[PDB]
């Protein structure tokens, strides 16, 4: 289980794996962690899988409510702001949810990190999950603020490759989601294993 | 004043509710349309002054992508009902992950309308009935559906129903013009003809509001583009 | 005069006029009729449209597989008892995993109807309910009243102009027990003839029916299957 | 239950006003004459006593003059019973303010706090409104010396000088004529109350026992409030005693 | 364990907050600003458990904004900490006890610039300078040596660099980037963010 | 909650047009065998019956609730009766809410019944486990009598009252040997088309000769 | 408690209680407001006090937030409850959403209260009609009027209180693109809008203005006389 | 659940106006504050000789230093006894001291204020005379149905109070002994009460440094020498 | 003292073919190492196209079954339509979270036909997460059945082998033999096998015997 996303001038790229396991035993290799909220809003998953589903769908309702209310297409910062509130109600009752908030608004391609306790953090580069520590190293070697969309995916691919390689709990197949002004697009679903021979030799 | 809300008449009627249906005769004239190709609703804005903005006042709002609205009489009474109607509509998709059918929309509104009461209840309950005549249209997998609702709270599937002050002669006129398979564009024609005839003011894009729902096209609010076209294409 | 204001005030003749006017509102609306044989029971509901452009109102409310009901009275007042009756039938199969008996349900519905009566401020229900159901003892036809009284009848006609309908039901009551499902619908629809004037009589469009039986769960028919039911009968 | 006997205060007249509130202002006019003056050196408060008998005692500090808190005080004209209800609620709001901010409540904040409670019964609840009109004096950190008048409808406002109760039209008219705005202070303007209380009282020979005077002045960073000595008020009246001759 | 520090001069109050928000072995956001603004002349700085900082700060923040609208003037720095203490004390014994250690700074036309210390138990104290976290060991002892009641605001920041450099030398946790602000009768004045290239 | 009046094994078996249910008359407080005369079996209308295990105290409370519920239908005279299913359905649902409230009634119950020639037998647990089997046991009887029953049920799925009860006589005979908390007294309740018929206390003749075979 | 219906229907369908509520609205002082180009300006007449009242409590032009202000005409009683609980919503909206308040968002929650007070058991409809005006995002001003019945409208120029219809006649006739062109012409229009219902009032007119990012600013009496000095 | 007290077109309270009208139609009651004690004299009139006098007393103690009398509806006074006694005990819990007279009558009259406001309850038809001794200062207060309590050196109420006040305008002087004030109150009720004057009909009690003490008919017989 | 649930064993595997969905599970119900009965069907039919097995603590399966059916028929009479296979998924997911603080312990697998007519499988977990997949398992033997699922259905780890869409004949061979192999080595599976197949006409159910131990 590894979830990473990072903000840059061209929008945000979301890169996660497909494998969510219970204990040492793998539950399903093809699990889809990334959750859809709105055409311009994209959710993530970490920790408990059901806590990410429910609350982001409840937020998806809240995103529709205000949009069915003032029709203003609520900002990305207010999304995680509404998410922080609802999570702080049950804080201490055992809810553990990692996640990220991706979207585009008048301010830009906003990126926000939400913790179980309601911590709301914007920023350029994030990561989370079990094996997230292996992602920071390879991702932080070299950086260009303005990313070429192709090599940007390669920087996202090579990250997930070696990340899931060292971690036993990170694996399955690659999931990649680019962010755009109007709406996000899913780049590819690609096996991790066959990407090695490229980097290996 | 020397009478109750629930007091029965010697003819078997409620003093309260009878004046409700009697109160809606002062509302704005609006007509719904159900066609084989979609659902069409029109409403007269009834602007009392140029300083009053007709764009801010909306008597047709979007609950779901399928379902529209209509308003007559006291405007805020409808806004109170549409608020909870939009909450339960998203509560539907929050559970079943699907759009609420047009029938289930009126069932939730009929329940909220029937709860009217005073004693033996909480202060957060509505004491008197609404002076609004409701028209709820929409299109789903079952096809186009248009329902009529009065202060009584009933909902019945009907092709067209007239509300407001002109509903007397309009509903009989909607019967004559609308028949068989008549579609959207042909419905807007006879719609704006009957409405312009009954209302005092002449037809204008800013004097009325029009919106339609189709199987392939969800609820679409007509802007100055579509409004100025249909009034000159009448 | 001064005794008609609420339910609590009794007349000097010992009569509550609000309950009396509650029975008057039932006579102000569509007339429905129903009957039961030794096997099948049918509820014939008369659908009425305000105009020809508007369609006909729905007088039948589906309750359960073994239970169905028709409404005559103030329209929306039956919606409160509907959702309550449906909730009670679901709670029966949710706990006992068994359909609630027909006689036991009406006894519980008559309780909820009577409670608001004596308590001031709560309006009594101004809609009459004709409910049918089938159990191990056979079908049952239960007619209720806004006073919360409910009876057991072979056939009953309520609503406006039900006089000549009841007279037809009494003379032909002896046949209603021995007739099969097809003849129950026939004489059941011809009983609805007396509830309307000599101009507009009956059509398959404005008349809907429903039936419950031994091995047959309660079903609702409106137009399609009703056309062969009506046609082939002399009036 | 018996809606026949329900007066329904919330019902508006065909003239667009309230029945009970309109009759409440008249009941205040039947009460005693009370006045107040806002001066440079502090606030001035004087009140007539309509109760006159040889068996009266009044063991308390004053009849119609009460002390709200350290920095504020009040007067009253109206129903004497509902006055103690409002006086207690003012002492509750002022002390609950001291809990959170640990500071004395400003004059305007304490006044608008009770007026929301006054009119809350006219908005709903079915209970009869209050027929009490209250005058407010005191000092706050910002606005300083303040004088406020309240109405039974919940409305209020600031005043440099005013009068409540009986002889309202005559006193306020006599007040404005000689009133010196931001000029005539406690010492001098105290002679005006005695001059006005003698005119408002129809019975001649104004007595120091029939009236009561209290002042509030902050000196050396400390708020000082006291009820003036009747023996001195007599000499203060002895001034007015020699005023018509000279 | 994030680190706060503040210093109250005669005419000024100097406050400094670490900008690093970290989780486990990595820094989530290293430049994240912990300094919050209660009003024009009164700010607030909080540190503690992650969610408690953000969340509880909005309570005091939004409720003071409601005060100015009613009475037309801002709260005093004394009334600030008071209103901050009781709300934190009332919620201390509630179902969700908050872990936060906050310094409250502000200015008044009479009391002048003020600095108020508060712990996670909502114990208010008035001190010329105070700090939070484990870094208070390596720093406030230096201030005891070089501080004087007459110290100028210029030598203040000049002195603060001696305490901050000990965090990069002896103190284990990184905390590379520091935020610095100062408050006086002229309002908030932002200063340079100290970094070690 | 407390060690209160713990019960013993509960045995039941289907046969043709009826159900055999047997349980001991011994109540047991802790390791002590204290109450040697108690009523484990209750008749529910004509066609249904109940017997239980675990806490006997908590059972009487829920035993009393059934009595008041049976009165409800008897006062109506609707011409119907509670089926063993519905009673087994109500019991599973009623005892279920005790688990969600963290105050579970601790019992193991068995419901015999006869409906229109089809004899229903059912099983419930404190935690709400419910199913239907031709042979049901409780506690260590599930470790002893249950395999003995299923050994005979393979060769004789269809049984009458003759061999059924006679086999149950042999079932509780082992419960003396390998079940330490059993006791001599027991009750045999048979539900037939004539209603519930509960015979009085009975005993069992056993063979201890294994003792004298040790010295051999 | 007290539980019964207050407002009930009539044989002609109109509401007795609500019509008497709007009657008390017209019985109040005359207040006006307009939506300027880059700003917003409010104003209300002052009944002339004689050398007594303090203008701190008498001021009828308030501010719900830095973005939005308001004025009221009607019974002064029910006006202060709405102002207080609307400012609570302004801080509650910022507490719930980091984004600032919206004029349309705050306005509807205000008029929604009066709708609740009308249909609630034992409550009473207010005798006030408030003008909610402020700045939206990007700086687009918005002017909304409330109703005791609970509805709210949008107005470019508006007048409330006594003679509201009389001033509205002056509005509709003299409101053009020439109106509310600049900050000066916007204020002079508000003054002239108060000159029809004024009888020998003179200086009694008090004004207020909100300029872009800045919060509501009260024009001093001398600054008011500067724009009032030009009449003929 | 609705308060029936409304404002008359003249401003008066109609329900409370008729409340005092019931008080004036009862038995006469007087009181005098002089020297170190306060006396309260009431007239107990039965309907025959078949009713026990010593069974029910009109003069009742509240606390050691405080006692009360009444003229008006009998049952309405029994409600105030329970609420006044219970209030004084709630006082003794917090401050662990005997309750002063000024503090007591304040919140006791607040009970009158509540039932003239809260709906569904009629106002009281009683008026009470408050007698108390605290810190060497005698306290004689008079309460009405509306809840307004005043301070009086002497007062008269019930029936023929106009002639009772006339006697207090003359017979009442200053520096008057408590014993002479008792006989003075007897001379006040001499004209009001007619028929046979006995010690059982009149009921007198006093409060002094030793506290509130009710007088026995045997002691009253010695006080009837006049 | 008191344990909120105990692991009862059992195994449920559901494979969704192209236009069909097959659901098969044993009848064996046990507690720990003790056996309850050899006939305990896990699969519970709801509507014509909907049949659902529940693997886990058996008592929590019945309560959900009743609450589901309580919402099903309540949806029917109110909404005048039956719930689609995809609609029951999101419904029961919200049902599980309402109890999140007292988690139901079960493995829920929905099966049937979708709106397009294809076989659909929805696998749940005690916390309420949901996903769609062609083939799912549950229970104790779910760990042992994955390599055989990744071979016949999965076609993984073979060198240049054609990928054929799964067929009913292969499924009857596959689903049985994987249970025949699982019932051998796993103690919690065996004694019988029931198969529930739903087509456009309706349900088709049959039972095939397994090893008695």
Residues in chain E, overall count: 197
- Read off the tokens for G86: 């609307």
Cβ contact (<8 Å) for C90 and I73?
yes
Q: Where are the domains of chain B?
A: 2-234
Cβ contact (<8 Å) for B51 and G172?
yes
Say if CB H184 and CB H225 are below 8 A apart. Answer: no
- Read off the tokens for I157: 């780890």
What number of CA atoms fall less than 13 Å from residue D86's CA on the CB side?
35
**Contact residues on chain G for E66, CB-CB shorter than 8 A:** 87-88, 90-91
Say if CB D17 and CB G24 are below 8 A apart. Answer: yes
At residue C179, φ and ψ (nearest 5 deg) are -80, 150
Integer Cα distance of I112 and I84 in angstroms: 9
Give residue I152's region: left, alpha or beta (phi > 0; psi -120 to 50). Answer: alpha
CA A27 to chain centre: 20
For residue I63, what are the domain limits? 1-213
What number of CA atoms fall less than 13 Å from residue C209's CA on the CB side?
31
Say if CB C193 and CB C164 are below 8 A apart. Answer: no
CATH of the domain at D175: 3.60.20.10
CATH (residue range H1-226): 3.60.20.10
Reference D42, options D207, D172, D213; nearest CA is D213
- Cα-Cα end-to-end distance for chain E: 23
CA E145 to chain centre: 21
Strand partners, A160: none
Say if CB C72 and CB F46 are below 8 A apart. Answer: no
Residues in chain C, overall count: 235
Integer Cα distance of D27 and I156 in angstroms: 96
Cβ contact (<8 Å) for G20 and D8?
no
At residue I187, φ and ψ (nearest 5 deg) are -80, -25
Of residues A1, A44, A128, A164, which has the active-site annotation? Answer: A1
Question: Which of E70, E73, E82 lies at the smallest CB-CB distance from D100?
Answer: E82
Subunit partners of chain E (3 or more CB pairs within 8 A): A, D, G
Reference B67, options B89, B93, B97; nearest CA is B89
Residue F8: how many other CB atoms lie within 10 Å:
26
Distance from CA of G3 to the nearest CA of H (A): 9
Integer Cα distance of B88 and C47 in angstroms: 30
Integer Cα distance of G112 and G134 in angstroms: 18
Question: Which of H12, H117, H154 lies at the smallest CB-CB distance from D128?
Answer: H117
Element (H, E) at I36: strand I34-37
Resolution, in Å, please? 4.1
Cβ contact (<8 Å) for D100 and E83?
yes
- Given strand G68-74, what is the order of strands in its sheet? G61-63, G68-74, G128-135, G141-145, G153-154
- Read off the tokens for D245: 């001759």
At residue E55, φ and ψ (nearest 5 deg) are -50, -65
For residue D166, what are the domain limits? 2-246
At residue H160, φ and ψ (nearest 5 deg) are 60, 35
Say if CB C19 and CB C31 are below 8 A apart. Answer: no
- Given strand D161-164, what is the order of strands in its sheet? D161-164, D34-38, D43-48, D211-219, D222-227
Reference E178, options E144, E131, E115; nearest CA is E131
Reference E43, options E89, E80, E5; nearest CA is E80
Say if CB D204 and CB D28 are below 8 A apart. Answer: no
Reference H104, options H69, H131, H76, H136; nearest CA is H131
How many domains does chain D fold into? 1
Torsion of CA A94, A100, A106, A108, to 10 degrees: 150
Q: Tell me if chain B has a CB within 8 Å of the CB of I82.
A: no
Integer Cα distance of E95 and F42 in angstroms: 48
Integer Cα distance of A60 and A83 in angstroms: 10
Q: Tell me if chain D has a CB within 8 Å of the CB of E36.
A: no
Surface-to-core class of residue F213, CB atoms within 10 Å of its CB (0-12 exposed, 13-18 middle, 19+ buried): exposed
Cβ contact (<8 Å) for D57 and H152?
yes
**Contact residues on chain D for E60, CB-CB shorter than 8 A:** none
- What SS3 state is found at C46? strand
Whole-angstrom CA distances from E132 to E140, E173, F105 are 10, 15, 53
Q: Helix (H) and strand (E) counts for chain G?
A: 7, 11
Cβ contact (<8 Å) for B96 and I81?
no
Q: What is the 3-state secondary structure (H, E, C) of C118-176?
A: HCCCCCCCCEEEEEEEEECCEEEEEEECCCCCECCCCEEEECCCCHHHHHHHHHCHHHH
- What SS3 state is found at G42? strand
Residues in chain D, overall count: 246
- Find the DSSP H helices in chain D: 19-29, 80-101, 107-123, 168-178, 186-200, 230-243
Residue D79: how many other CB atoms lie within 10 Å:
26
Complete DSSP assignment for E147-177: --TT--HHHHHHHHHHHHHHHHHT-SS----
Distance from CA of C22 to the nearest CA of B (A): 6
**Contact residues on chain E for A88, CB-CB shorter than 8 A:** 51, 55
- Read off the tokens for H206: 């006093």
Distance from CA of B225 to the nearest CA of C (A): 32
> Strands, E, within chain H: which ranges?
29-34, 37-43, 60-63, 66-72, 126-134, 137-143, 149-151, 154-157, 202-208, 211-214
Whole-angstrom CA distances from H196 to G21, H55, H158, H190 are 66, 21, 20, 11
- What SS3 state is found at C110? helix
Say if CB A102 and CB A51 are below 8 A apart. Answer: no
Cβ contact (<8 Å) for C86 and I66?
no
- Counting CB pairs under 8 A, whether chains G and F reach 3 or more, is no
Strand H154-157 and strand I106-113: the pairing is: unpaired
**Contact residues on chain G for E70, CB-CB shorter than 8 A:** 84, 87
Element (H, E) at C115: helix C102-118
Reference D97, options D71, D79, D125; nearest CA is D71
Reference G65, options G93, G28, G90; nearest CA is G90
Q: Tell me if chain E has a CB within 8 Å of the CB of G94.
A: yes
Integer Cα distance of B147 and B162 in angstroms: 11
- Read off the tokens for G54: 């303090």
- Read off the tokens for D195: 């001059």
Reference F161, options F7, F23, F52, F14; nearest CA is F14
Integer Cα distance of I28 and I8 in angstroms: 10
**What residue of F is the nearest CA neighbor of C103?**
F78
Fold of B2-234: 3.60.20
Cβ contact (<8 Å) for G96 and A70?
no
At residue G108, φ and ψ (nearest 5 deg) are -65, -40
Q: Go through E57-77 and write b for each residue having 16 or more CB atoms within 10 A of its CB, e for each that does not.
A: bbebbbbbbbbebeeeebbbb
Strand partners, F192: F195
Question: Which of H8, H110, H169 lies at the smallest CB-CB distance from D84?
Answer: H110
Surface-to-core class of residue B202, CB atoms within 10 Å of its CB (0-12 exposed, 13-18 middle, 19+ buried): exposed
Q: Tell me if chain D has a CB within 8 Å of the CB of H125.
A: no
Whole-angstrom CA distances from F130 to F140, H165, I30, I107 are 18, 90, 12, 18
Reference F124, options F148, F138, F108, F137; nearest CA is F108
Integer Cα distance of I17 and C201 in angstroms: 56
Active site residue A1: yes
Residues in chain F, overall count: 216
Surface-to-core class of residue G51, CB atoms within 10 Å of its CB (0-12 exposed, 13-18 middle, 19+ buried): exposed
**Contact residues on chain B for C21, CB-CB shorter than 8 A:** 8-10, 12
Surface-to-core class of residue I93, CB atoms within 10 Å of its CB (0-12 exposed, 13-18 middle, 19+ buried): buried
Cβ contact (<8 Å) for B110 and C76?
yes
Say if CB H18 and CB H145 are below 8 A apart. Answer: no
Complete DSSP assignment for A124-175: SB--EEGGGHHHHHHHTSS--SS--HHHHHHHHHHHHHHHHHH-SS--SEEE
Whole-angstrom CA distances from C96 to C93, C215, E188, F60, F83 are 5, 21, 71, 21, 9
Say if CB C232 and CB C208 are below 8 A apart. Answer: no
**Which of the listed CATH numbers 3.40.640.10, 3.40.50.2300, 3.30.559.10, 3.60.20.10 matches domain G9-232?**
3.60.20.10
How many domains does chain C fold into? 1
Integer Cα distance of F87 and F42 in angstroms: 13
Element (H, E) at F95: helix F84-100
Integer Cα distance of G54 and D160 in angstroms: 7
- What SS3 state is found at A123? coil
Contacts of H186 (CB under 8 A, 6+ apart): H41, H202, H223, H224, H226
Say if CB D153 and CB G77 are below 8 A apart. Answer: yes
- Read off the tokens for B117: 């009461």
Cβ contact (<8 Å) for A50 and I143?
no
**Contact residues on chain F for I29, CB-CB shorter than 8 A:** 129, 131
**Contact residues on chain I for C99, CB-CB shorter than 8 A:** none
Reference E78, options E52, E42, E47, E50; nearest CA is E42
How many domains does chain I fold into? 1
Please state how this structure was obtained: cryo-EM
């Amino acid at each position: 289980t590894t979830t990473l996303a990072f903000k840059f001038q061209h929008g945000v790229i979301v890169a996660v794996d497909s494998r969510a396991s219970a204990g040492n035993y793998i539950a399903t290799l093809k699990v889809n962690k990334v959750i859809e909220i709105n055409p311009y809003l994209l959710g993530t998953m970490s920790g408990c899988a059901a806590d990410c589903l429910y609350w982001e769908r409840l937020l998806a309702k809240e995103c529709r409510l205000y949009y069915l209310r003032n029709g203003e297409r609520i900002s990305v910062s207010a999304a995680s702001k509404l998410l922080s509130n609802m999570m702080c109600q049950y804080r201490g009752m055992g809810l553990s949810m990692g996640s990220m908030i991706c979207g585009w608004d008048k301010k830009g391609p906003g990126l926000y990190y939400v913790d179980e306790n309601g911590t709301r953090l914007s920023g350029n580069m994030f990561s989370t999950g079990s094996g997230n520590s292996h992602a920071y190293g390879v991702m932080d070697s070299g950086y260009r603020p303005d990313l070429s969309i192709e090599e940007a995916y390669d920087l996202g691919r090579r990250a997930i490759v070696h990340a899931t390689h060292r971690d036993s709990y990170s694996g399955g197949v690659v999931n990649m989601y680019h962010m755009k002004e109007d709406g996000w697009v899913k780049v590819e679903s690609t096996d991790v294993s066959d990407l090695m021979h490229q980097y290996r030799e | 004043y020397d009478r109750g809300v629930n007091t029965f008449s010697p003819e078997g009627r409620l003093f309260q509710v009878e004046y409700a249906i009697e109160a809606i005769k002062l509302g704005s004239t609006a007509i719904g349309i159900q066609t084989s190709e979609g659902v069409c609703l029109a409403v007269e804005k009834r602007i009392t002054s140029p300083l009053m903005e007709p764009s801010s006042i909306e008597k047709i709002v979007e609950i779901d992508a399928h379902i529209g609205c209509a308003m007559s009489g006291l405007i805020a009474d409808a806004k109170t009902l549409i608020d909870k109607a939009r909450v339960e509509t998203q509560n539907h998709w929050f559970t079943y992950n699907e759009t609420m059918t047009v029938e289930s929309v009126t069932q939730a509104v009929s329940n909220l309308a029937l709860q009217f009461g005073e004693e033996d209840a909480d202060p957060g309950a509505m004491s008197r009935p609404f002076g609004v005549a409701l028209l709820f249209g929409g299109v789903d997998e079952k096809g186009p559906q248009l329902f009529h609702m009065d202060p009584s709270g009933t909902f019945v599937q009907c092709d067209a129903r007239a509300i407001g002050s002109a509903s007397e002669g309009a509903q009989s006129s909607l019967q004559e013009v609308y028949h068989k398979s008549m579609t959207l564009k042909e419905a807007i024609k006879s719609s704006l003809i009957i409405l312009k005839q009954v209302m005092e003011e002449k037809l204008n894009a800013t004097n009325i509001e029009l919106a339609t729902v189709q199987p392939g096209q969800n609820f679409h609010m007509f802007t100055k583009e579509e409004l100025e076209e249909v009034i000159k294409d009448i | 005069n001064q005794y008609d204001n609420d339910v609590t005030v009794w007349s000097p003749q010992g009569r509550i006029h609000q309950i009396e006017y509650a029975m008057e509102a039932v006579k102000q609306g569509s007339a429905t009729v129903g009957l039961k044989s030794k096997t099948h029971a049918v509820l014939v509901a008369l659908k009425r449209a305000q105009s020809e452009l508007a369609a006909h109102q729905k007088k039948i409310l589906h309750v359960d597989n073994h239970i169905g009901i028709s409404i005559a009275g103030l329209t929306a007042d039956a919606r409160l008892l509907c959702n309550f009756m449906r909730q009670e039938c679901l709670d029966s199969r949710f706990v006992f995993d068994r359909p609630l008996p027909v006689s036991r349900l009406v006894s519980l519905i008559g309780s909820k109807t009577q409670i608001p009566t004596q308590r001031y401020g709560r309006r009594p229900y101004g809609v009459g309910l004709l409910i049918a159901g089938y159990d191990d003892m056979g079908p049952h036809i239960f007619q209720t009243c806004p006073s919360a009284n409910y009876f057991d009848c072979r056939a009953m006609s309520i609503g406006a102009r039900s006089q000549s309908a009841r007279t037809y039901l009494e003379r032909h009551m002896s046949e209603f027990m021995e007739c099969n499902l097809n003849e129950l619908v026939k004489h059941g629809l011809r009983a609805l003839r007396e509830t309307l004037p000599a101009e507009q009589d009956l059509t398959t469009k404005n008349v809907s029916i429903g039936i419950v039986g031994k091995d047959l769960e309660f079903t609702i028919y409106d137009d399609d299957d009703v056309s062969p039911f009506l046609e082939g009968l002399e009036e | 239950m018996s809606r026949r006997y329900d007066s329904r205060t919330t019902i508006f007249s065909p003239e667009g006003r309230l029945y009970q509130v309109e009759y409440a202002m008249e009941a205040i006019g039947h009460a005693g004459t009370c006045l107040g003056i806002l001066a440079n050196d502090g606030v001035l408060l004087a009140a007539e006593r309509r109760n006159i008998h040889k068996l009266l005692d009044e063991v308390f500090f004053s009849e119609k003059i009460y002390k709200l808190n350290e920095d504020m005080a009040c007067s009253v004209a109206g129903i004497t019973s509902d006055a103690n209800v409002l006086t207690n609620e003012l002492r509750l709001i002022a002390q609950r303010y001291l809990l959170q901010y640990q500071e004395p409540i400003p004059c305007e904040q304490l006044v608008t706090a009770l007026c929301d409670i006054k009119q809350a019964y006219t908005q709903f609840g079915g209970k009869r409104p209050f027929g009490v009109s209250l005058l407010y004096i005191g000092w706050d950190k910002h606005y300083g010396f303040q004088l406020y008048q309240s109405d039974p409808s919940g409305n209020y406002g600031g005043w440099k000088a005013t009068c409540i109760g009986n002889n309202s039209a005559a006193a306020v008219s006599m007040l404005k004529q000689d009133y010196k705005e931001g000029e005539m202070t406690l010492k001098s303007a105290l002679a005006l109350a005695i001059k006005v209380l003698n005119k408002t009282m129809d019975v001649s020979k104004l007595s120091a026992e029939k009236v009561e005077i209290a002042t509030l002045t902050r000196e050396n960073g400390k708020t000082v409030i006291r009820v003036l000595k009747q023996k001195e008020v007599e000499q203060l009246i002895k001034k007015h005693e020699e005023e018509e001759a000279k | 364990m994030e680190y706060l520090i503040g210093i109250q001069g005669p005419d000024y109050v100097l406050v400094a907050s670490d900008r690093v928000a970290a989780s486990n072995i990595v820094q989530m956001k290293d430049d994240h600003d912990k300094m919050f603004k209660m009003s024009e002349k009164i700010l607030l700085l909080c540190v503690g458990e992650a969610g408690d900082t953000v969340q509880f700060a909005e309570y005091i923040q939004k409720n003071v904004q409601l005060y100015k609208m009613r009475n037309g003037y801002e709260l005093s720095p004394t009334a600030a900490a008071n209103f901050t203490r009781r709300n934190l004390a009332d919620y201390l014994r509630s179902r969700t006890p908050y872990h936060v250690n906050l310094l409250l700074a502000g200015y008044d036309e009479h009391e002048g610039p003020a600095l108020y210390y508060m712990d996670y138990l909502a114990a208010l104290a008035k001190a010329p300078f105070a700090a939070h976290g484990y870094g208070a060991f390596l720093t406030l002892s230096i201030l005891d040596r070089y501080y004087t009641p007459t110290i100028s605001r210029e030598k203040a920041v000049e002195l603060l660099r001696k305490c901050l450099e000990e965090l990069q030398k002896r103190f284990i946790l990184n905390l590379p980037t520091f935020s610095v602000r100062i408050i006086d009768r002229n309002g908030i004045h932002d200063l340079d963010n100290i970094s070690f290239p | 909650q407390n060690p209160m009046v713990t019960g013993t094994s509960v045995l039941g078996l289907k046969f043709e047009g009826g159900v055999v249910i047997a349980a001991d008359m011994l109540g047991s407080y802790g390791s002590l065998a204290r109450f040697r005369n108690i009523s484990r079996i209750m008749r529910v209308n004509n066609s249904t019956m109940l017997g239980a295990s675990g806490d006997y105290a908590d059972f009487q409370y829920l035993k009393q609730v059934l009595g008041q519920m049976v009165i409800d239908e008897e006062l109506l005279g609707d011409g119907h009766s509670y089926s063993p299913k519905a009673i087994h359905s109500w019991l599973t649902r009623a005892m279920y809410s005790r688990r969600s409230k963290m105050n579970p009634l601790w019992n193991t119950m068995v419901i015999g019944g006869y409906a229109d020639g089809e004899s229903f037998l059912g099983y419930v647990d404190m935690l709400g486990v419910a199913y239907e089997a031709p042979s049901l046991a409780t506690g260590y009887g599930a470790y002893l009598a249950q395999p003995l029953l299923r050994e005979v049920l393979e060769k004789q799925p269809v049984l009458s009252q003759t061999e059924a009860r006679e086999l149950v006589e042999r079932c509780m005979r082992v419960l003396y040997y390998r079940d330490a908390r059993s006791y001599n007294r027991f009750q045999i309740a048979t539900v037939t088309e004539k209603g519930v018929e509960i015979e009085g206390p009975l005993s069992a003749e056993t063979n201890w000769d294994i003792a004298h075979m040790i010295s051999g | 408690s007290y539980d019964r219906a207050i407002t009930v229907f009539s044989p002609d369908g109109h509401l007795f209680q609500v019509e008497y509520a709007q009657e008390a609205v017209k019985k109040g002082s005359t207040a006006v407001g307009v939506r300027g180009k880059d700003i917003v300006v409010l104003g209300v007449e002052k009944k002339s006090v004689a050398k007594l009242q303090d203008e701190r409590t008498v001021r009828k032009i308030c501010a719900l937030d830095d973005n939005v202000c308001m004025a009221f005409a009607g019974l002064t009683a029910d006006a202060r409850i709405v102002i207080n609980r609307a400012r609570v919503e302004c801080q509650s909206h910022r507490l719930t959403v980091e984004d600032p308040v919206t004029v349309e968002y705050i306005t509807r929650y205000i008029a929604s209260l009066k709708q609740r007070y009308t249909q609630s058991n034992g409550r009473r409809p207010f005798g006030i009609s408030a003008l909610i005006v402020g700045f939206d995002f990007d700086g687009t001003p918005r002017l909304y009027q409330t109703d005791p019945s609970g509805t709210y409208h949008a107005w470019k120029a508006n007048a409330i209180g006594r003679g509201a219809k009389s001033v509205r006649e002056f509005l509709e006739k003299n409101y053009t693109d020439e109106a509310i062109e600049t900050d000066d012409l916007t204020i002079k229009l508000v003054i002239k809008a108060l000159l029809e219902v004024v009888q020998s009032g003179g200086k009694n007119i008090e004004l207020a203005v909100m300029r872009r990012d800045q919060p509501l600013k009260i024009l001093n009496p001398e600054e008011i006389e500067k724009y009032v000095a030009e009449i003929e | 659940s609705f308060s029936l007290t409304t404002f008359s077109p003249s401003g008066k309270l109609v329900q409370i106006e008729y409340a005092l009208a019931a008080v004036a139609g009862g038995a006469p009651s007087v009181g005098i504050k002089a020297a170190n004690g306060v006396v309260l004299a009431t007239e107990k009139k039965q309907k025959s000789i078949l009713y026990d006098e010593r069974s029910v007393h009109k003069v009742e103690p509240i606390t050691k230093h405080i006692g009360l009398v009444y003229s008006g509806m009998g049952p309405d006074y029994r409600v105030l006894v329970h609420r006044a006694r219970k209030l004084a005990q709630q006082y003794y819990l917090v401050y662990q001291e005997p309750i002063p007279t000024a503090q007591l009558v304040q919140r006791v009259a607040s009970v009158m204020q509540e039932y003239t406001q809260s709906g569904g309850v009629r106002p009281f038809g009683v008026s009470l005379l408050i007698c108390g001794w605290n810190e060497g200062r005698p306290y004689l207060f008079q309460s009405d149905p509306s809840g307004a309590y005043f301070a009086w050196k002497a007062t008269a109420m019930g029936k023929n109070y106009v002639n009772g006040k006339t006697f207090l305008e003359k017979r009442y002087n200053e520096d008057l002994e408590l014993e002479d004030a008792i006989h003075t109150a007897i001379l006040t009720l001499k004209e009001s009460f007619e028929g046979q004057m006995t010690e059982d009909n009149i009921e007198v009690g006093i409060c002094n440094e030793a506290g509130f003490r009710r007088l026995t008919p045997t002691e009253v017989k010695d006080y009837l020498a006049a | 003292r008191f344990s909120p649930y105990a692991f009862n064993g059992g195994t449920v595997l559901a494979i969704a073919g192209e236009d069909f969905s097959i659901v098969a599970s044993d009848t064996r119900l046990s507690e720990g190492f003790s056996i309850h009965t050899r006939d305990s069907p896990k699969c519970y039919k709801l509507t014509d196209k909907t049949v659902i097995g529940c693997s886990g603590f058996h008592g929590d399966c019945l309560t959900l079954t009743k609450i589901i059916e309580a919402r099903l028929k309540m949806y029917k009479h109110s909404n005048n339509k039956a719930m689609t296979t995809g609609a029951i998924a999101a419904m029961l997911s919200t049902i599980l979270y309402s109890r999140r603080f007292f988690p139901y312990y079960v493995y829920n697998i929905i099966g049937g036909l979708d709106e397009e007519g294809k076989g659909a499988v929805y696998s749940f977990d005690p916390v309420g997460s949901y996903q769609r997949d062609s083939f799912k398992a549950g229970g104790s033997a779910s760990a042992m059945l994955q390599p055989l699922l990744d071979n016949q259905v999965g076609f993984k780890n073979m060198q240049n082998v054609e990928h054929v869409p799964l067929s009913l004949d292969r499924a009857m061979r596959l689903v049985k033999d994987v249970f025949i192999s699982a019932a051998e080595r796993d103690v919690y599976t065996g004694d019988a096998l029931k198969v529930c197949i739903v087509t456009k006409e309706g349900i088709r159910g049959e039972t095939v015997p397994l090893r008695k131990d």
